Structure formats: C-alpha cells, structure tokens
Design a protein around this nucleic acid. Structure first.
Lengths: 293, 289, 285, 285, 283, 288
RNA sequence: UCUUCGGUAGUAUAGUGGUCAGUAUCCCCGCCUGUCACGCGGGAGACCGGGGUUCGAUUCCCCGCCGGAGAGCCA
C-alpha cells in the first residue's frame, strides 16, 4: 500500500513540476506585454543640434500701429551699431513688404504688419537695426508687438498669404518690446518631430533690454523711440527628435523574448521530468534490490 | 594504419577542449559585459517629455510681498486685448479674492512678511489676466523693488490650515522673483509637472517676463512717487510633464542571458555532432563492406 | 503517380520550409538593420540633479569700457544688500585681476577683464554685489558687457591666461547688463557630456532688471551708474548625459537566438512531413 | 655480484642530497623573503606643481604687534619701508588665541596669514614687526608653517589646528632682527595604508638689517620675516614594497619541479650505466 | 556506476579549466605588478670619493661693491686683518663680464666670477672680501650663484649664454653685511634616463659675527666676507633604477605554465588511479 | 628510393638543426640577459630608509674647543622654552658634567687643544635642552667663534681607554661646526645611523642651527668683550636608518634559469614528438 | 512497394537475463636471443541509434539508421 500511495505522490509531483513552468511562462509573458504597453504609452527625448552655417531668411511680423518705420538698416556685421541721432527718419535700406490681413480670435478688426527679412549669417552675426517713433498719446504704455516665423521667402512666394498671419498668431505666441528701450533679441530656432508630417518650427529668444539715453532728443511732448535688434544667438538648430521604443521595439522584443523564454520553459521541464522519473525508477530498483539481493 | 586513430586522438582532445574553452570565454565575457551594461542603464534613467493639454487651469498661487505698499486694483480682465487706460494713484475696483497671512521668516527665522495672495486667473482659453496696480509714494529705501512668489493652488492653501508651513515650503522650494520697481512686468506663467519615484508630481512654475516701460508721467512723481504694475496670465494651455523611466528591465536581462546560454549549449552540441560525423564519414570510407 | 507524386508533394515542402526560413530571417535582419539605422537618433537625453552643498566660485569676466568700479561687497551671510550711496568708492574687496588682452576674434580690439571670484555658498544665498560708474559721453545706448567661464581656480591655476581667456570669449556668448538697472543676474550650470566624457559645462542665467532712482545725485548730463548682483540660484546642478540605448550585443544575441526558433520550426516541419507520410501510408495501405 | 651492493647506496644517496638542497633553498628563499619584507624601499617623485597650494603660515608674536604686510607678485627687490609705522594689514590676519595643548597652562596666541602664491613669478609675502624692548634677552618669535590654508578657512573647530600642528613639527623660530628670510618647499610621503602626509621643509637665510634709519635710543626691535616658495618641484615620496608577492612561491614550485626532474634523469642515467655494466659483465664472463 | 565514473571524468574536465582561469588571473596580476613597478622607479645612492675636486663655478653680483681681498688660504685658518677696507692680495683666478638678464631681459648682470678651491684634502678656502657704501636699501645683500666648473667658462664659448642658461636652476643664495658667511659646498650628481649627469650644488652656510669696531664705521658702511671650502671629500651619486625587467617575469610565467601542466597531469594520474575501483572488479 | 631517402633525411635534419639552433640562441640570449641584470644590480645597490622611535636618547658628547673663553654658565633647562636668564656676563651656576681633557691634533700633531666635553640632553619627550653661556676676552679675535663637535657616546667615552684616539677618530670623522660669536645658535641635533655592511653600523649627527640675535643692553659697552650663547636640543624623538638592500638574489636568479631550461627541454621533447610524427609519415610513405 | 537476415574494441568473431563484454591481430612498456621483433612477460581500446519490461537487461518487445538477401512496378 506504501507503493500504491507512492505512485500517487509521484504523479502529484509530476503535475506540480508541469504546472510550475506552465504558470511561470504565462506570468512572464503577461508581465512583459504589460511592460511593453507601458513603454508604448509614452516615448522618450532624443535631441540633436545639427549646427548650421547659413541660416534661412526668417520672418518678423511687427505690428507698429500708428508708429513710423524711421529706419530698418541692416548692419551686415557691425556688432557695435553706428550711433545716429534719434527722432528723424532715414535709411530705409530694408526688405519690408507691408501686407495686411484680418486678425483671427477677433473676426472683426483689420491690422497691418510690415513683415521684414531677418538676418541670416550667424557666423558674421548679421543684425537688423530698427527705430520706431510715435507721437505720444493717452496709451501711456508703448509696446509694439512682433511675431516670428521660420521662412520669409516662403511668405514671399506663397499664393493666398492668409495662412502666413491668420495662422502665425493662432500658432505662435505674441511677444512685445518696450518703448524707450533697445530690446536686444537673440533669437534661436527649435524643431520638433511629429508623426503626421515631417517636423515643425518654434522660436526661442533671449530679450536683453538696455536703457536708452534720452539725451539729444528732449521729448518735450514725450516722443517715445522704440529700438530693436534681431540677432542670431547660435549657429545651432536644436531639433527635438521624439524617438519611440513603442511601435517596432515592442513587437520585436515581445516576440523574441517570449519565443526564447518558451525554450527554457520547455527544456527545463523536460529535463526535470526525465530525471525525476529516473529517480523514481531508481527507488524502485533499490527497494527491489533489497528484495532480491 | 593507425594514422586515422592518431588524427582522431589529436582532434577530439584539442578541438573539444578549444570549443569548451571558447564557450566559457564568450559566456562569461558576455554575462559580465551585459551585467555592467545593466548597472549602467540603472545609473542613468531616461527622461520622457510630452504636453498634456488643459482646457481650464486651476486657481494659481500668486503671492505678492509688498512691504508697506498700498494695493490699488485687482481687475481680472477676462479677455481684454489690452486693459483699458487707467488713471494712476486713485484706489478702487479691487475685486480680487485676497487673503493676508504673515507669521515668520523661513530664512533666519527673522520676522513676519505679509502677503496678498490672489486667486489668480483660470481660463487660459479666454486668456484671463489679473492686472494689478501698486503705489510707493513714501520712498525711503530709494532702491525700488517688490517681491512675489507663486504656488500651486488657492483652495489647497485655503482648505489646509497649515498657513505658516505653506509659506515655509513654498519659499524654500520656489525661487523669489521680483517684478521690477516702476514699470509693468507682463509676467506670463507656465506649469511644469515633474514626476517622482513614488508617483508624486511636485510641480514647479516657469515664467517669461517681458518688461514694458511706463509713460506714467501723469502723476507728478517729483516727490518720489514710484508706482508699480503687474500682469499675470497663463502662457499656453499645454502643460509639460517630466518623468524619468527605467530603461533597463531585469526581466529582460534574465531572458537575454538564459537565451545566450542556450545558444552556446546548442552551438557546443552541434559542434560535437559535426566533429563526430566528420570523424565517422571516414569510418564508412576506409572500409566498404 | 500513386506514390511518386505524393513523394514529390512531400519533397516540395522541403524547398517551402527552406524559402520560408530564408524569408523570415531576411525580414528579421532587415528589422534589426532598420533599428541600427535609427541608431543615429538613438542618442537620447538622461538628466540628473546633483544636490551640491558647497559650490566652486566661478570667474566672472566683466568687460567694462571707460568705467571705474566702486564696490565688490560680497554678502557671504547677508541675503539682502544694505542701503548705500551713489558714487563714493568703497570696499573694493573683490579679487579684480585685470588681464587686459587683445581680441581673439579680430585680434585688434581692446578688452579689459575684471575677473571676480564670485560666491561660494548657496544654502546661505551668497550675493556678490557690484557697482560701476561712467561719466557721460556720446553713447546713445549705454551697455557694459560681461561673460562667464567654468571656474575661477581653473583660471588661476592654469598658465597662459592669454589663450585661456581668448578662446573662452569666442567659445561662449556675451550677455550684457544695462545702464541704470540692478541687473540681478542669477546663474546656474548645465553639466553636459561629450563623446568621450570630457564633461564641458556652460552657464544658465536669468536676468531681472529693476529700475534705480537717480534723483540722489542729480545727473544733469546723463551720468549712468550700473549695478550687478551676480548670485548663484540653483541649490543643485543639472547633469545632462547623452546615453545611447542600443548595443550590438543585444542585436547579435537576439538574432542568433531567434535563429534557434527558426531551426526548431524546421524541426517541426521535418517531423510533420514524416507524420503525414505515416498517415498517408495507413490510409492507402 | 659485488657491484650490485656497490651501487645499491648512491642511488638513495643522490635523492637524499637533492632533498637536502631542496630544504636548503627553501630556507634561503624564506629568509630572503623575510629580509626583503623587513626593509621596504622608497621611491622619489617630482611633480611640477604650477600654482597656489595655499599654506597656513602661523606666527606667535605674543607682544610684537604686526606693523606691515605685502604681496610682491613680481618684485625681487622689495622697496623701502618706514621703520615703525603700524598698519597695512594686507594679510588675512585671522587672529585666534588658544590655550596650550602640551603644557596646558600657557595662553598662546596666533596670527595666521595667507601664504605666498605664484611660484612661477615668485610671489613672496613680506612682513615687519615691532616690540617695546623688555627684560627678556634673545628676542625670538616662534612661528609654525603648517599647510592647507584654504581648508583651514572652511575648517570647523579651529582649536584643533593650533592644538595639533604644534606636535607634528619642531616650531623653528625667527630671530629678533635682520630679516630672517625663509624659503620653503614640500615633501609628499606615502603612508602604509595608502594615505599621504605633507610636510614643510625650509631653508632660512638671514641678512643683517641696517639700523641707520630708526636710530633707536633704547634697543628696540624691528625684526622682519619673509616668506617665499623654492623650486615648485614638490618632492613626492612613496615607500614601495619589494616585489615578492608570489614570485617567491612560483619559483619555489619551479625549483621543486626541476629537482624532481633531475632526480628522475639521474635514475634514468644510472639505469643506463647499470645496463652497460651488465653488458660488460656478460662480455667478460 | 560506469555513468558515475564518466560523470567524475566530466568533473575532472571542468577542473581542467579552473587551472586555466587561475593561470590567466595570475598573468593579469603579474602584468599589473609590472606596470606598477614601471610606474614607480626606485632610487639609489652611492657616495663615491674624489681626491681632487674640479675648480667649481662661483658667480657673484656685488653691484656697487668692490673685492678687497681674494686670498686662497691653502689650508691655513689664521685670519689676516691688514685693514678692513684696504684693497690687496687679489691672488685668485677671477674674471668679470657683464651680461644682460636672461629672465627679466632688461637689467644687466655683472658676473664677477671667481675660480674657487680644488684640494679638499688641504681644505682650500677662497676668503673673499667686499665693502659697500651706505645706501637706503635698509639691509645689505649679495646674490651669488654656483655652476659646475670654472673651466667650463674658461675654454668654452658663448660665455653670455653659458651664464644666461644658469639663471633660475638654483635659488640665489646671499650673504649679508657685517658677517662671515662660511659656505661649505657639496656636489650632488643625478643620473637620469638619457645618460646626462646634471650636477647640482648643495651647501650648508654657517654665519659668524664680525667685528667692525676697529674701523669706526659710524657713517653706515657695511662689509662682507665669504669663504667657499668644500665640505666632504665625496660626491653623492643618486641613480634612479627601474626595478621591472620583462626578461625576469617571462620565466615567472613559464614556471606558472609548467606547474599548472604538472597539476593537470597529476589530476589525470589521480583519476587513472581512481580506476582501481574497476580494477578491483577486474581482479 | 635514394631520392626519397635523401630528401626526407635532409628535411628532418634541417628541421632538427633549426630548432636545435634556436634552442641554443635562446639559451645564450637568456644567459646574456642574466649576466647583464646581475652585473647591473651588483653595480648599483638600492638603499632604504626607516624611522624608529625612542623616548630617552643616550648621552651624546659635545666637543667644544674654547680657545680662551670659559664656561660662564651651563644649565639643563628641560621643558623650559623660556630658560631662566640671569644677569649676563657673570660666572657661576654650571650644573652640568664636564671633563676638561686636552689631546692631540691629526693635522699639526703638536697642539694640546682643550675640549670641555659635556653630555647633551636626553629627554626628547620633555624637550630637554642644555644652555651653555660663555664669555672671553677678544683682544684679537676679529671673527669670534668656538668650534664644537658631536659624538654619540658620553658614557662609552668615560669608561673607554686610549681617550686620545677616542677623541682623535671622532675629530677626524665628523666635520667641525662652529657657533657664532655674539649670537644664540639654537642647535636641534637629530641622530642618523646607517646600517652598513661588514656587520657594523655607524652613526652620524646632522643638525640645523638657527641663529637668533642677542641684545646687550643689560651689559655696559666694553672693548674686548663679546659674549655668546649656544643651545643644544633634540629635533625629533626619531632615529633615521639608512640601510642599503640588494635587489639581485642568486637563488632566485638560478631559479629563473632552471625554469627556462625546463621549458626549453620540454620544447626539445616536443621536437622529438615531431620527429616521431615524421617517422610515421615516412612509414606511410613506404606503405604507399 | 512488400518480405527476411544480420550490425560489438581499429580490425575478425565469442559472448547473454544475474559477469575478468573474452580471444587472435592491432596499440603501449621490460628482456635484447645480431638488431630497431624473427621470439617471450606485463599494461590499453567496444555491444547501430531511440523507446519499453525486468532488481539488472548488450540478451526479451516496439520504432528509426546501415548493409546484404529475395518477390517486384513502385512507371
């Protein structure tokens, strides 16, 4: 009767060894699929700078309003602008093209905008020096807004330019420089990576205002004089590449890991069951050898 | 002729010793290198960024710190493209949810500093702004400046009675920006949600001031009338989220190592079978019958 | 045709399994080759925050013109600058170490460095107050440049300050401070990693100008008094490291091991053809 | 035959001799290992330090108040000075006084200063003192020259520096006159554990001081004291151990193997001799 | 049980590789020790003896002084005092040429060079003497430097360069006024890798007071006196020795290889002896 | 078969001669490097240092040579960095041990130079220091100074005999210092012993004097009167040992030689194995 | 396609339900009888593979691999 119980105990051990590795496999595959779904939930960041040598012509959509473009001189490399007496017009050696459109988010108002061509040569540090004057009024807070878009010649050679300002304000953000300062804007360009098209352009900038010596002007009525430059901070275009360990990585790693752990989950069980039936037969051998020595 | 026997004696010994030596020399090499790589990847968790959109922000924690400065207005201009022109100096129109707390200084435990916490803007979509106005006619420092800090939520401060520790932890964590003394500082703000190992999102603020000079010469400021201005608003509806994820999975480490061990076992067995076959083909070639 | 055609139908499965395994292997190696084409973008960013307590004092290369310093009062303990007076030179207690050399860009211009030690502690908010002065001239906009580099001691200990400062000027950028504002320049470090781990660093800074009342010295010509409050802001430094996510060892291991499941599938094919042969033998016998 | 008894002894004799020389050589090599372990050798190293290494110069005037300091960043001829004028405390006169650690009864003072820098340009501290002449003869002012001024500043519990650095030096003084000029240099010895110790050694060179300027009427004192740096080639000392980590045991095993091989070869050769002797015996039988 | 015997044979097979691992570990340890020994070269000194020292180099920059006596007391120590200030007894091989500064490049240096003493057995000493007019510098001094041999200045050319090179190698010792600075000099030779012998001078001054009461120097004029005896009749010979020789560790590696071969062979013989368990069945 | 026999024999012979040769080349090459290494390490012995420690030094001799002066004051001020100073220039209070010997010179062999031998301080831990105030009449001593010489055994000087030679040899060996005529020469003598070969080690005194000036305001200005103080101490409670070790060991070197000879013998055995492989190849050649 | 016969050291076989899987040759070592074996004395190498019964199966049974033997269309 002892052997009749032993043949049941060893069957129980057989089933235990089978189901141990039949449950480990399912637990591991479920854990791996859950982990790879988690990885699919959110990708990681992969930046690259790809420094350039000759920037494109950028777009600067000023909204001067009632002011006047006194000067838009392009200091081709002159990091120290030639001092000139404020308060009078002159030297419109600029690439301005006054083009207006209706502003969205309002649906009721017209607003003009003298989009100008920005500097290109970062190595030479090309500049653009502006000067806006306005007869003082009740506004008491003189800020002249300005937008920024990547390509200017694209605006030059695009039919139905409605997009170029009816979408810039709806996409970009509206900065503004002060009245009575010289807002030094050191722009830079940053590119993202979307799955729909190819990429996108977003601007960054570091305004560094410096005071304006009101002498030699004497604003008796209070004539404010806006002054703006638009440098190019760096020859580098930090592009954001949103790399994913999500679509191909999940599938490939899933299939490989599972089909290669099934290998052990089968081989170890086979070896263990073979050797345990071997030891069962060995116990039978030793008891029957005690019987028939 | 024992030439075949001697060639066998050379081959099985040297070839098999070489193959079970190269097996170890590759297995231990790869296991050590990949364990080191696992430790390295555990050393440097990779960051994850995205932009979860928010239609309507909560009530932020703008907390002005005016030392003996008189508030003049709180107009929460809901959507105004530019706030309407205001005559300075005159008080009134202070429709801001305001509370004053002052217990102790977190730094040096020096003294009390009263705050003027405002509920702050909510609707980013309609570009809510909370345009302030200040006044410091009686100047003795002669070195103008006004301090302000931001915290996460208003009702979180309001409901919790930990008033002193609110301005303890907020002051210790958030830096102390100071909007300029005299001209309006259009302080757009944005939120950054960084995650932690425990799932806690300890948020911090990010702002991009844009100082606009004032032409407030309608005040006769000869006596020392230095009046300030502030504008808060929410920069973009989006919110940045920061989460550092573990790039190394030990449950993939173990799978990779057991798989390469199985590869090496199969390679050794195949090599043994192949050498046995190449040895035994001459056995059927030396004798024909 | 009763048995020869069946044997041909069995043997075409041999070529079938060969071509299937070839195609699957080619597809898998194509996927892995695309992965190591993405290897170009595999440089990813991993950042950490070293909670540093005591900080290295950094050199602060100011580049004044016709200006003259007035104070360097380092408020090691004080986080607040006590009230002071315009003009009136006093307590030039900094470590001004003028090394005025020629331009590194055009090699013609004259620059006048005034390296200051800067602060050390950040838990105590160690300010480094400064002050300048300039009698008015035809200077329609007034600005006093400056610049930064990694460490003061790396300037003091290293020899040949000529190239040490000349290359640093062109390498970094120059963000100035204005004529009449307390340009409260905070500062912080980003610790990036190069291809080998040389660990170059550059400076992040958040200026915040603030107006200064000038009635106390009645400048009747345009006298300008600058003020700079260089101060370390971050109680911890950011550590940018560009780790790469893929190594060829994983590629070769996974490929050569899915090769084994391919071989096992071939084994099942070789068993199944024999099983079908046995079944057909039983059926047609 | 009798030749068998003749040769049946030197067989075991040669193995006995080999065992004897084996134990002799193992004793010789173990004694050599003991000797080479009991006499570690040193290695001298020169490093070309280019810069500061701020030392914690100390002085113990007690009654001789300071009257001058200087820092001649490049001046091998320090110019004239007024004898007896107090002030110009350009030194970082971090004055601290502490009780004796050794006698535990004397209220000792200190006038720690900041040490010379710029060894390349030979920057040299300079001093000047004064003391109303008292009953004590042989006017002497003790002074230590411990190192690490920069860490001395930030160090906590400054009593320990004074109470400890006295024991680890000999406190060489400077005289009551004639500008005891004091050069100095460093030695960097390596301890047994792995740490290192830095000690200052100095080469005074006194030069007589002309008193044709003070014209004292009592016998007052104006003893200077001058510091500098000697050649920057700081001596690094390392006490390396004789290279016997495992070579002794490996060559012990080698001599073991060769002696066993030689014993076996001796057996082979003597067996060959026995074979040829048996052949000769059969020839001559 | 034959399967057990083959499994023990497989155990010996596994043991066969732990010897390889230990050998490779010892090889790595040996290569690390070799690199360490090539990283810290050892030093040695041998005090050789010299019967007749070379006539050394003595550079002096008196400035506005004037050598009043240059007597070679061959072995006598009796001090003659004719007059503290008179010029006389210039009995030495002296030679002065002024050269511009090789360091500042502006000033000129007046190298009033004196040959010096040779016979250490007789303890030759070159008793100098110098007087200076009163000046405002408030403490007198004379920088003086030494070089290898006066003959290296006598016959050699480029005498301007031959002194200009020896500018900052030494530390510019100096004797004072109203003193008798006794300078016992010794010479140390270092032996570096490139076969050159850089000679250096090391000396131990011992100032002794002087009596000017016999000259009535109330005005403020100071005197100077120097001697330059050679201290020891020896020369320090410091040699840096490399203590690592690859041709002394290749034999170490070979011995390791032989002992591991013997160990493996003994393991094989041990399992062959273990076959006695089957040999008993054969019996 | 003649051609095959000739070619095989020449091929085997050239292989064996090539390896046999190499064997000899590496043997002579290694014995050459052995010769070079052993001769080089015999030429340049390598020296070592160590620092033992004591708390109570023995009594060292101090051979003063006062030509005309006198022991105005001798003391044993231990532990007192402020020695009790009396009125200068007044004799008495000599609480030391002396022996006014007067022996011969090695250079003149005729002068009976005095030597007021004293024993130095011993308590380094309590920094004991002697104090030897003197005075002379300097009628003509324009550069006043009295020599002093250090030997390391006062106790062994006492009980020993032939004291003329016991002072003669120490005078010859150690160089003669001198203390200033009008200063205070603080002499912090350290003790250095070198463990030489021949079963003998010798001691050497090295010291760094530090003159500190003396003020004579307490004595009336006189002609032919300059006094001077000399101080002896103990620098460190250490004793530096300079011992020379030897790098080369004949036992180790012959061990290397035996190992490489074993390796080359095994290489020749593998050459013999190649010979037997050639023999079997020739057996196959004749079988075919 | 079907039906038998056999498969063992490197060679030839002999063994078989309970074990010096043996022997001759071949492989190694001691003797040199004129010789590197012409002759002796000691030591060494194996059940075609897989599964199943049996205390144990190289033996008993089944399935695959290898030959050789026959009918032979398997076209």
């Amino acid at each position: 009767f002892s052997r009749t119980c032993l043949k049941n105990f060893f069957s129980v051990l057989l089933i235990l060894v089978y189901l141990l590795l039949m449950g480990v496999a399912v637990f591991l595959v479920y854990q791996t699929i859950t982990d790879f779904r988690d990885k699919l939930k959110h990708p990681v960041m992969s930046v690259s700078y790809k420094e350039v040598n000759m920037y494109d012509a950028p777009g600067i959509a000023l909204y001067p309003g009632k002011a006047r473009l006194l000067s838009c001189e392009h200091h081709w490399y002159d990091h120290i602008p030639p001092l000139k007496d404020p308060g009078q017009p002159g030297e419109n050696t600029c690439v301005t093209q006054d083009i207006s459109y209706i502003d969205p988010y309002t649906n009721k108002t017209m607003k003009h905008a003298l989009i100008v061509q920005g500097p290109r040569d970062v190595r030479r540090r090309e500049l653009v020096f502006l000067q806006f004057h306005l007869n003082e009024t009740k506004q008491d807070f003189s800020a002249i807004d300005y937008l920024l878009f990547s390509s200017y010649e694209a605006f030059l050679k695009s039919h139905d330019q409605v997009k170029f300002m009816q979408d810039c304000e709806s996409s970009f953000s509206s900065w503004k420089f002060s009245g009575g300062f010289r807002t030094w804007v050191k722009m830079s360009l940053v590119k993202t990576k979307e799955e729909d098209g190819s990429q996108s352009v977003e601007f960054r900038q570091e305004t560094s205002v410096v005071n304006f010596i009101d002498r030699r002007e004497t604003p008796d009525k209070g004539d404010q004089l806006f002054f703006v430059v638009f440098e190019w901070k760096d020859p580098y275009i930090q592009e954001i590449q949103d790399i994913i360990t999500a679509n191909p990585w999940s599938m490939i790693a899933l299939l490989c890991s599972v089909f290669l752990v099934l290998f052990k989950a089968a081989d170890f069980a086979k070896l263990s069951v073979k050797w345990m039936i071997k030891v069962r037969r060995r116990h039978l051998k030793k008891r029957a050898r005690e019987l028939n020595h």
